[model samples]
Target: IFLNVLEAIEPGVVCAGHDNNQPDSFAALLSSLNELGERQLVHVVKWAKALPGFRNLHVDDQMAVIQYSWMGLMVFAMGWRSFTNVNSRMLYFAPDLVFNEYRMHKSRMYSQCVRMRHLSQEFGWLQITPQEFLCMKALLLFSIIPVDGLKNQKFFDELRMNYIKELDRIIACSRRFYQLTKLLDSVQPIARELHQFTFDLLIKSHMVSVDFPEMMAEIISVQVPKILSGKVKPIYFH
Candidate 1:
C-alpha cells in the first residue's frame, strides 16, 4: 500500500516554464532552473502530504523535513528522469529545461551536471527497481535535519526508521541493501556541493541577473546556509 501510494501520487512531467526561444545565456538558464525549483517544490509538499506515514509526523516536523529535503529530492528525481528518458546522456531537469552540453557550461553547472549524470547512470548500472526508487526517494525526505533536532524528535526518528525498514522490506538480499544504502549516502555530497553553489549564486544573484523565486531565495539564504555551515547534517549510512 505504501508503495502503491508512492506510485499513484507520483507527480508527472513538470515543465520549467523556460522561454527556450531566448538564447541560452547564463542568466536565462539559471532563472528557468530557479523557476523549475520553485515549481517542483510545490509538488514536493503535496507529494509528502500524501505519503502513507507522512501525516503522522508533527506539522512542524513535516515542514522542517520538507524544507531540508527538497533540493536533494529534486536532484534525485531529476537524475531518475534523465536515466529513464535519455539514457543519462543529458540532464532532464524538466521537460522544458533539459540541459545539454552548451547549457551546462552556460549555466555554470557543468561539473554539477556531470555529477548528476553519473548519479543517473547509477540507476541503470545498479538495476534499481521502481519499488526501490520510490522507497529511497521517500527516505530522502527523512535524511537531513538540524544537529539538535525537530520539535517532536521522537516521532521524526520513528518515521525515518519506518521508511528505512520499508526499504529493507523491498530488498531481496543483504548485498542489495548495502548497495542501496551506499547510493543513498552518495546523494549528500552532491547536495552539499549544490548548496555551496546555490548559496554563492544567491549572494551575487543581482550581479549575475539570476532571479531566485521568493521562497527559494529565503530558503537558500536561511536553511541552505545551515546545511553548508554544518548546523544541519545528512544522515549517512556509510
Candidate 2:
C-alpha cells in the first residue's frame, strides 16, 4: 500500500529526462524524493491508526516520531544525490522556487486541516539528519577526486573506501530509524530490498566510478515497486 503510493506518484513528481531532456538532474531527482517523503508520511498516519500500540502512544510522541521520520527521509534524499555539476545545481534551484511559491498555500492548508499545533510547527520546518551531513561531506570529496584525477590504484582504492563508508553510514542510520520507529515490522522487507538495490547501483557504481545508469535503475526500481504494490496512489496533471 505504502509502496504503491510511492510508485504511482514518483514518475510525475520526479524531474524526468523529458522535463529537461537531460540524462538526469539533481533537482528533479530531489523533487521526486521529496514527493516520496510526503507519501510516506500519509502512509504513516494510516498505519498509526491501524496499529493499537502506535495509537496508544501519546499524541506528542507520535507526532515526534512522524517529524523525525520525515526529517530522516529528507536527509536520505539530499545525501543520496548531492548534485555537483551546473545542470545539477540548476536542477536543485528549480524545486526551491516551487517550494517557496507554495509555502504560503501549504501553511494555510495545514493550519486548517491539522489540529496539533506542535506537530504542525515541526512539519513546517526543515530538519537535517546525520545521513544528510555525511552526504554533504561525500559530495565535497567527489569534487576533489576529479580534480586530483585518478592516477593510481591507491587513489581509486581510497575513493572507493570513502564512498563505501558514506553508504555504510546511510544504511546504518536507516536501520536505526526503522528500529526506533518499529517501521521494520511493517516496511522492512520492502525497505531492505530497496536498500540493496540502491547500494548496488549507487555504492557499487561509484566504487567502479561508472556513469549514472545504476543510480537511475535504483530510483526507478525501488520507486516503481512501491506504486505497483498499492502502497501509493498517483495524481496526474495533463
Candidate 3:
C-alpha cells in the first residue's frame, strides 16, 4: 500500500511552486520554502489517504505516520530538487533563486546549503533516477525514529521491511549491488540538517516576527517531524 503511494504521487511537481522567488529575508525565505512545502504536503497527505494498510492501523498511528514522517520527506525533496548541473556550482532552490558556494558566504546557511547541494548533486539530478529516488523516499519515510506518544510505532516495522526489500530490488536492477550499496552508504539522514537550518535561521533572526502571507502558515507546518522533542542537537556540517 505504502509502496504504491510512492509511485502514485507525482514527484516531478513536488517543488513546482517554490520555483519562482528567491529569499531576501527570513520572511521571504520561509515563504520560498513553503512555496514548495505546500505542494509536498499535498503529495504526502493524499498518499497517506491512499494506503489501506497504513490507514487500517488505528487513527493515532495513521496520523502519526503523516505527522512524524512528512517533514523529513519534504526536506529530502528540497535537497533533491535543488541540484545544480554537474558542470556548474549554481543550485536552483527556486526557478528564480539560484546560489553557489561563493555567493552564499556570510549568509550563515552556506554549510547546510552546501550539504543539501552535495546530496542533490551526488544522488539527485544527474546521478539518481526517478525510480531510485522514489525508492529512497520510501525508505526514509519508513525508517521511523520512535518518539513518545507514538503508541504503535512498531507498526511501521513491516512497512520498513517491505520497502527495504523493494529498494534493494530496485537498485539491483540498475547498479552492481556493491556499487549501489556504497552510494546508499554515503547518504545520511537529512532531517537533522533541516532542523539545524531552521533553528539557526530563527535564532539568527533574533526571534522577530516577520510578516507573511496567510497561506504560508500551512507551508511552515511541516518544518520538522513533530512538535519537536525540545532537544537541540549539535551539528557538524563543516
Candidate 4:
C-alpha cells in the first residue's frame, strides 16, 4: 500500500526534481524515518513507566504520550537530518512537546545507563564496596533535590562536594575499566559528551548556580547508554 502511494506521488514529486531516480531513494528514506519514529516512541513509553514522577501521574494524565512520541521522532529525525544533509531547520518545525521530551528522555536514559554500568563492574556487582554504593545512593538522592535549593544551604554545599567526589571516583573507575577491559572505548566518548552537554545545560539554564558535584555524578550516571549506543552524534540535512 505504501509502495503504491510512493509510486503514485513520485510522478508529481520526483519527475519534477533534478534527478528522476531521487524519489526512489527518498521513498526508502521516508520509510526508514517512519520506523525510527516508531522505535523512539516505544522507547519513550518504556522510559515513562520507569520515571518516578511519570509513574505517579493519574492514568488520564499518564495517557499523555505527546512528549514521548515527539521526542522519538525528533531524535530519529535529527539522525536523518545529519545524514541526508537536512539542516537544523527541522528542529524548529518540531512541536515544543517533542523537543522537551527529547531533553527529558535523553537525560533519563543517560542516568540509567551510568547506574547500570556502575553496577556491572566487578566490585559494583559484588556489592562489597561502600564507596560505590554510597555514590549511587547519593546520586539518587541528589536527583530528588532542586539544584537551586542546594545553593544557599551550607549543609547542601558540603553534600554537593561529597557527591562530586564520589562521581569523580566513578569516572576514575570507568577509566580503569576502559584500560582493563578495553571493551567500552567507543561507548565512553558518548558518556563524556553527554556529561558535557548536561553540565552546560544546567549552567546555561541556571538550574544550578554553581556546578554542584552531585550534578556531575548525575550527568555521568545517566549518559552511559547514549554514549555507548552511538546516539550522541550530530544531525545532518540536505
Candidate 5:
C-alpha cells in the first residue's frame, strides 16, 4: 500500500532546459545545473508533502527537514534515474541535460560525478527492486537533521521511524538490511562533497559567469552553509 502511493506520487521527468546545441563551457554547464537544481527543488517540495506520514511533521520541521535533506534526496534520485535509464553509463541529471565525460569535466565536478556514477552502478549490482528503491529514497528524506534538533523533533522522529519500518517491510532479511543501509551510508559523503563544491562555486558565481536562480542562490547561500558548518548533519546508518 505504501509502495503504491510512492509509485503514484512519483514526480515525472524534469528537464534542465539546457541548450545542447551550444558548445559546452564551464559557465554554461554549471548554469544549466543550477537551473536544474532550482527546477528539481519545486518537485521535491511537492513530493515530500505527498509522502505518507509527512504531514504529521510540524510545519517548521517539514520545511527544515526538506531543506536539510534535499541535496541527498536529489542525488539519490538522480542516481536511480541514471541506473534505470542509461544503465549507469552517464549522469542522468535530467532528460535534457545528461552529463557526458566532457560535460562532467567542464562542470568541474568530475570527482563528484564519478562518485555519483558509482552510486548508479550499485543499483544494478545490488539488483534493487523498485519497491526497495522507493523505500530507500523516502528514507533518505528523513536521513538528515540539525544537530540541535528541530521545532518538533518528536514528530520528526515518528515520521522517520515509520519510513524505516516501511523499508524493513521491504527487506525480509538481515543481510539485505545491512547491504541497503550500507548503500544509504554511501550517499552522505557524496552529498557533502557536492555541498562543498556548490558553496565554493556560488561564492565566486559572478566571476565564473554561473547564473543561479533566486531560490538556488538563496538556498546555497543561506541553508547550504549550515551543513558545511556542521550545524546540520546527515544521519548515517553506519
Candidate 6:
C-alpha cells in the first residue's frame, strides 16, 4: 500500500541524454551541475510531500527537513536514479549530463557523487524496491541531528521514529527481511565522506553561487550553515 503511493509519485523521470553541444569548460559544467542541482531539489520536494504526515509538520520543520537533508537526498536521488555506460566510461546524471571516474573525479563534487556509483551499480542487482527508496529518503531526512533555528526537535524525533516504523511495516514480507534496515545502515559510509566534503566546502569555495537558484542555495546552506553567505542563519544537521 505504501509502496503504491510511492510509485504513484516517484519523483521525476530520470531520462538519459547529453545536453546539446555539451559545454567543454569546467565552469560551464559547474553551471550545468548547478541547474541540475535545482531540478534535483524540485523532485525532492515533490517526493518528500508524498511521505506520510510530512506536509503536516510545522512550516519550520518542513523547510528544515527539506534544507538540511537535501544534500543526502540529492546524492540519494542521483545515485539511485543513475544509469551506467561502461563502454563510454560514463555515468548519466539522469535527464541530462555525464560524468567519469578520472576526469570529473578531480572535482570535489564528483569524487563524492561517484563514490555512490558503487552503490548505484549494486542497486540494480539488489533490486531496491520503490518502497525502499522512499523509505530511505525519509530515513536520511529524519536521521539528521538537531540544527540551529529548528524549534520542533522533540516533535521531529518522534516523527522520525514513525517513519522508520512504517518502513519496517512496508518491508516485512520481503524475502530479504530487514533489507531496508541494511539499506539504512549502508548510508553511513556515504554520510561520513560527505561530512568531510561538507567541511571542505564550508571553509572555502562554499559552493553557493549568486546566480544559484533558491533550491540549491537553501540545500547547501543548511548542510553547512556557518559559512553561508545568504541570510539563512548557521543551523546544521548530521
- Model 3 weakest lDDT span, ten residues long: 229-238
Model 2 TM-score, 2 decimals: 0.24
Is candidate 1 or 5 superior in lDDT? Answer: 5
**Candidate 5 ranges beyond 4 A from true positions:** none
> What tens-digit string does per-residue lDDT give for candidate 2 at 33-138?
4344445445445543343233444454444333323323333233223332121221222232222223323322223112122222222232434343343322
lDDT of 2 at 229: 51
Each prediction's whole-model lDDT (CA): 0.90, 0.34, 0.53, 0.33, 0.92, 0.60
lDDT of 6 at 164: 68
How many steric overlaps does candidate 1 have?
Answer: 0
Whole-model lDDT, model 1: 0.90
> What tens digits encode model 4's per-residue C-alpha lDDT throughout 61-147?
343322212332233223222222222222211221111224324333345334223323423223323333333322222222222
User: Compared to the true structure, candidate 4 yields what TM-score?
Assistant: 0.24
Worst 10 residues of 5 by lDDT: 59-68
Q: What is the lDDT of candidate 6?
A: 0.60
Q: Count the backbone clashes (under 3 Å) in each candidate.
A: 0, 13, 1, 13, 0, 1
**Model 1, position 177: C-alpha lDDT score:** 93
Off by over 4 Å in 4: 1-24, 66-69, 76-238
lDDT of 5 by residue, 113-217 (tens): 999999999999999999999999999999989998998899988889998988898886999999999999999999999999999999999898999999888
Query: lDDT tens string, model 3, 33-118?
Result: 54555555666777666643565455666655665566566655555666534323565654545565654553446776776666
Candidate 4 local lDDT, residue 202:
41
Ranking of models by TM-score = 5, 1, 6, 3, 2, 4
Clashing pairs in 5: none
Q: What is the TM-score of each candidate against the true structure?
A: 0.98, 0.24, 0.67, 0.24, 0.98, 0.73
Q: Which candidate number would show the highest TM-score if scored against the true structure?
A: 5
